[PDB]
């Protein structure tokens, strides 16, 4: 059965709290990332998803937390739950994103 990798960060507010030290430098604001299922690692711009455990870094100004989530961690339960399967499929179809993936 499925169970989140980090049960402690299953709550949005708990995730948001980790972004206290998040660099103000980055365009991806704490709200966007936390709502996407991410919590800050405390190092650089590294984040991890509470459900799948996957971690993303090196965020570009043009990156949307949800898109990056669905593109790289397409098997993630939280993405499927909040965004749906079609979104995941559409994300992977967008040229710019498809190329990131290679």
């Amino acid at each position: 059965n499925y169970f989140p990798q980090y049960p402690e960060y299953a709550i949005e507010t708990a995730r948001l709290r980790t972004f206290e030290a998040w660099p103000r430098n980055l365009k991806q604001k704490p709200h966007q990332l936390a709502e996407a299922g991410f919590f800050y690692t405390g190092v650089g711009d590294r984040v991890r998803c509470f459900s799948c455990g996957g971690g993303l870094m090196d965020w570009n100004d043009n990156d949307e937390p949800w898109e990056q989530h669905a593109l790289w961690l397409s098997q993630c339960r939280f993405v499927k739950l909040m965004k749906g399967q079609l979104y995941i499929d559409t994300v992977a179809a967008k040229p710019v994103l498809a190329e990131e993936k290679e």
């Binding site: 990798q5 590294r46 991890r48 799948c52 455990g53 996957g54 971690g55 993303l56 870094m57 090196d58 965020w59 570009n60 990156d63 990056q68 790289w72 961690l73 098997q75 990131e100």
Partner: peptide, 8 residues
Amino acid sequence: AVPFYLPE
């Protein structure tokens, strides 16, 4: 973004 960790 690029992943630094992906599930097994």
